Prior knowledge:
With 171 residues, chain A is an alpha/beta fold. Chain A is 39% helix and 19% strand. Chain A has helices at 11-14, 21-33, 49-62, 82-89, 95-105, 134-144, 148-153, and strands at 2-9, 38-45, 67-71, 92-93, 119-122, 125-130. With 114 residues, chain D is an alpha/beta fold. Helices cover 23% and strands 30% of the residues of chain D. Chain D is built from two helices and five strands, in the order βαβαβββ. Chain D is globular. At the D-E interface, strand 1 and strand 4 of D face strand 2 and strand 3 of E. The complex binds calcium ion (3 copies). One calcium ion binds at residues 64, 123-125 of chain B. The PDB classes it as protein binding. Keywords: self-assembling, tetrahedron, nanomaterial, molybdenum cofactor biosynthesis protein, mog, protein binding.
Amino acid sequence: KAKIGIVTVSDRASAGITADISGKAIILALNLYLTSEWEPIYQVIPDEQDVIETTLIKMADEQDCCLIVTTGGTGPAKRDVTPEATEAVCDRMMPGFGELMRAESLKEVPTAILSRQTAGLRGDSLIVNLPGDPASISDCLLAVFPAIPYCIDLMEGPYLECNEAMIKPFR
Amino acid sequence: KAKIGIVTVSDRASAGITADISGKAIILALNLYLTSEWEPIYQVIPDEQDVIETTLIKMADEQDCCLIVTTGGTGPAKRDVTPEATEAVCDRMMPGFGELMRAESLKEVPTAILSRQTAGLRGDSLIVNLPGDPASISDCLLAVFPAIPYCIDLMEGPYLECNEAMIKPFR
Amino acid sequence: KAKIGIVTVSDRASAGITADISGKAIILALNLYLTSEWEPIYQVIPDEQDVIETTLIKMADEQDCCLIVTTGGTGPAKRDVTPEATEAVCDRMMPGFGELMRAESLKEVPTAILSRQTAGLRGDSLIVNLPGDPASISDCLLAVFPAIPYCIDLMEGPYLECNEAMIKPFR
Amino acid sequence: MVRGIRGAITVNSDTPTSIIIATILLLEKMLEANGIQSYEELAAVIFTVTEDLTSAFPAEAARQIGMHRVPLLSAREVPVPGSLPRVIRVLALWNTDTPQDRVRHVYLSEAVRL
Amino acid sequence: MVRGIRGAITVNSDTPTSIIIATILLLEKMLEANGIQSYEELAAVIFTVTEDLTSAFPAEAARQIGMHRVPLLSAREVPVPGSLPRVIRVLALWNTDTPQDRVRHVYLSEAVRL
Amino acid sequence: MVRGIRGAITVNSDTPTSIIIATILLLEKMLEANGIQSYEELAAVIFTVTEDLTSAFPAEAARQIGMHRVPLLSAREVPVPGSLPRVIRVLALWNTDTPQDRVRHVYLSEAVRL
Amino acid sequence: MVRGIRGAITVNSDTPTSIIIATILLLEKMLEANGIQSYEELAAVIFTVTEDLTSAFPAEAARQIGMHRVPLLSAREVPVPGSLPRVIRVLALWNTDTPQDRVRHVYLSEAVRL
Amino acid sequence: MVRGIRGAITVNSDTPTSIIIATILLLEKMLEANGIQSYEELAAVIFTVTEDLTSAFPAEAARQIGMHRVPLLSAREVPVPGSLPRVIRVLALWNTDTPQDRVRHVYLSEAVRL
Amino acid sequence: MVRGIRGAITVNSDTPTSIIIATILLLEKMLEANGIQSYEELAAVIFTVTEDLTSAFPAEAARQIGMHRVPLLSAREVPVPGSLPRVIRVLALWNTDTPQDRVRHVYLSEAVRL
Amino acid sequence: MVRGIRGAITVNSDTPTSIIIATILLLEKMLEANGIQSYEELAAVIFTVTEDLTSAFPAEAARQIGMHRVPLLSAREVPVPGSLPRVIRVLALWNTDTPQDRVRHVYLSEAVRL
Amino acid sequence: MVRGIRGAITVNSDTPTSIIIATILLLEKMLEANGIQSYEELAAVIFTVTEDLTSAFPAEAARQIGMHRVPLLSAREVPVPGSLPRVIRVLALWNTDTPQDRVRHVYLSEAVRL
Amino acid sequence: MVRGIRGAITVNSDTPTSIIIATILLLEKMLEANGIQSYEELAAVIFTVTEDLTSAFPAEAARQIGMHRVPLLSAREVPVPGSLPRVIRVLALWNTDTPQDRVRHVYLSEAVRL
Ligand SMILES: [Ca+2]
Ligand SMILES: [Ca+2]
Ligand SMILES: [Ca+2]
């Protein structure tokens, strides 16, 4: 079965103060998208770059996640360092992901340029940054996910099949 | 009072040959935008990367500028190094600024892809690159400034209030 | 005469298995674009980053190419490293090229965000990444080339004149 | 002896993924807030959506969390000018002796403004 | 053990003042006719409006008489050609052992024609 | 203590004769399947119709089989693109202690696809 | 004894920020070029704008540099086909004995083409 | 040695009677406020009107108070969105040695808001 | 000490050749009638054109007779319904001590009707 | 004694650069596949393009590889609904004694689907 | 040494079944009339269709009778007003020494009128 | 062993008389230039016309000079923007051993620009 990583990056959620509905939303979306068998590998971590790096590396190298989706820590706030941790652990970056997500959100909020999400590849693993806002989660995934199964195809990863009524990937 | 940095990067202007109307334009715009008290910290410097870096660092760390706006040295000309100096002094980058400015200018000039402006954060300071062209100044600021007061909000900086008739920031 | 570099990056083509129609297409396009005298400097190389770097450096520094156009190795495939080799040999990057090419292709394929092309400057040489797909070559060049003669102008390079019926550069 | 439970939530777009997710979140939150232990406690659940949401049935989300044996119905909300856009509303009919003032109603995201 | 109560009333114009007033009148008349003593007796209340009434939520009128702790929902009625225009309909779900034939339904103004 | 009963049926045309007949058939089948012996057992019945059915009230059919003392309400269904056309849906609220998994829901004609 | 001073400047967009800034720049440059020391020397100032500029009054920019006691007037320029777009023109009426050939007129940005 | 005098006034309708009357009132008030004793003191007078006033020439009103030997010109004002509607503006060019800060400008009716 | 000079002329068509020629004729006639000996006597010259004339700048004609060092400005006239079509108007500001009643204003072609 | 040679190729856009390049590629590939050594072997070459390609003549590309002395003709293809978009087709008439089953036809890019 | 063979046929409707059948009939009749024994004798075959026929490729019919190794091309005919509607035309290029006046051309159905 | 012959000619109007005459002229000139002595030498002749010529078949003109036993076909040319208007093009397929560089192609009237 394909293994997909979900990383919630939030001091408040990892401290057990706020509930993590951002992470729950991603899992719900992925369950709606995929019709093929897959195992969610999920973890909540604080906004500490050392921890994030270690987490992403553990998920891609040790636990063998073809796709790792992070949420939170992509803003201009002092503690938001998820993109930096992502850039540190990846050997190649995918500028097209952050470009498209910001492009789709700008039709709504002018403050979409304050978002700093990127995407990259560590070995055969695709890592994608989503914003912390639970409402923005679905719209962000919906924008970039139609390209993700084909990306994973090119890295000899698992062949993800999708629910067409929910989402249509291009090959 | 909020302190805002204006950095004109130009060999000709710093040498006192050409008049700096690019820098004067930014100050005029900011005076039209902001209704809250603020102090302009302004300086003209040559296209020397060591000087630019030192200047930006002095303005953000020592003089405590919440926003620093540079103009000039963002092209493919041999001496244009303002984005490099910016990337050197910032701990986190904001790709969304350069992306949007180039996107708005492409509707006019195809040569908007020759622009290399970026934006970044040094501590609690936002640094934004504007092109040298005085005419392009207003249109570039108008594009990204509606997000700047909220960005500064997220960094516990000064609460900038705006003239709505001139510009409308989103919060 | 102006000298323009064409670099085909492909294991299969350099091994002499597949024919290089991607490289031939670029030369055909450039012959259609330019009405001024120019000399094509062409070479096929594998997807090895050390080789690509050396090749680009040899073309820009030793053979004095004002423009170097590469094709291939811009995808998420494990061996695709052309953008990395490009970023290594350039002193300044041009984000606007990759941004526009992906923007024009997204109107067709959602998988345009899997493209990782960039552009940069090494001294007085502009290096531009094109995808490997022969069909995408014309549309990608057509998008960014109207800015290239003016870019080369700003670096004191050769004054390229164009066939207006084929393409119209802006100055 | 029945108590209604109201819920509401907003979405940022008219897509199936967004509507279903928001509905699931709201439904799960409604059940938890009131301490419901089984779907067997529900007489029925009714949904409404504003006219700017047409891409999906909210009832589909309830079936994603196993509400198969629960009767579901959906309808369109009155399209009042200037009213909050893109709202999914829920009325769950709950078999309980809970006092009216002890029932907990759930308003999420921008729907808090309601 | 629940009994529905139906009500209906017409208005002469699509304005908020008219819709809210008519609804309040109907609601108060529904409660009085059946001898209800407390809002705690109501499981829920559902409203519908015809498509020619869009300026206001009927549910707002119920909150004007203090039905804050009562769950409310509104929807659009089927727009049948030639059917009575500008009708507000109410279905109150009442926790009671009142026999079906002893429940009193309330039809006001031109809605009497229904 | 209430259980909802869901029903659905399709028609081939937007005419009053078709909608009323289909509704009567569905209603009668819903009652029989659950062994209901009297209309007095019904708290209320709610109908929805898709937007391609406007010629008649489904509630009229219930009155054709003597459901005069039963409270009825109708509303419009969400018009989802690609969703099954021309559907009449019913939610009957039934006063019963029947277990949730022992209630029988009725889907007729092309509505079986739902 | 009066001399007119002409100025002109272009903008790249019809926004208030651009028009006001360009006007301020032009005005300041006009005054400096002619060595004017006080606003009291100005009888009046007249502006025109092309029809593609409607978002702002040029006269507002003059008040931003303290020309409150100076009388200002603005009008629309003739919209000639193929003529230079987005031009702000100024005619300042200056109380001076400066010879006609010693007055300095100021044409900025793309307006130099005029 | 010339001083401009600014005036402005609004009207409630685009009719000739209204525009001419308002203009006469403004003109007479401008002259009185500055203590002008003869039309011979005026070099010229320029008018502008907003685009919502087309029925009459303001210059006609000046001739109604005998300004026949005074040169008059009229033009259209810039049509800024959200700007005050229906405004007649005047710029009189006055031959005088009056200091700039001793000239009196006249803003009447709703034009006071300017 | 300034006197305005008014002129006006009509054309039969909206072409550049016609507008420029008519303007030159009017300008030359204005200067001759008042005995002006040099362009240095002119503070400034302002033109207006009716909305049915857009093909050319009147200011261009003044430069055809060497008014290069004279400041020129043009604007659009108010488009009054039923008013004389196709009119070029001129206001020259003349540095002179000529009495107001000794200045000569020039109205040519069909513009005499004004 | 003549044999036709068919070719086809697709493009992703209706631009001259794309059409000419694709045509050159196809033409060169057609010649190589059949071992043609000189343009003198060609009686004539005919092209067709689908209706979604209008920006350029395919015949122009043949002249880019020196087919000046070869007679060329182009026409529009039948616009069948659902048929492959953006196709350039070639029919070369070749003077040869090559058997019909030894002639090699060339289908490139998405045109392979044909 | 080549001879063209012309054919033509009409259809009564723009459907694939009709166009393909008519084409097959015409093609078979063309071959028989001239005594052709093998498809190897054909250099190439060209089709045209009038603008009122778009549903199918005529070339498809030739492949239905095994003309796979024969090169085929199709184009649109000139749409002359009042000209015969719905015509499929064929030009077969035949490798033969047959005299020009001994070649047999085939015109079928209403196409005989041509 | 076949050689194509290209011709082209323009007309000033889309009328039958003009198209037929121009075609006859071109055809006669094509034959004379190459020294053809009989129509029996022609395998076939193909015409194209630009989309701005629809009033007549070019093939009709060939029959006016007795090309009855010669097979003719016509098609529409690609409508390239900015391309030469109103062009009749001819491709004659000639049975000859004439070298490719000894064939004479004929371009008449404004078609010389091609
Ligand atoms: Ca791995
Ligand atoms: Ca600081
Ligand atoms: Ca070099």
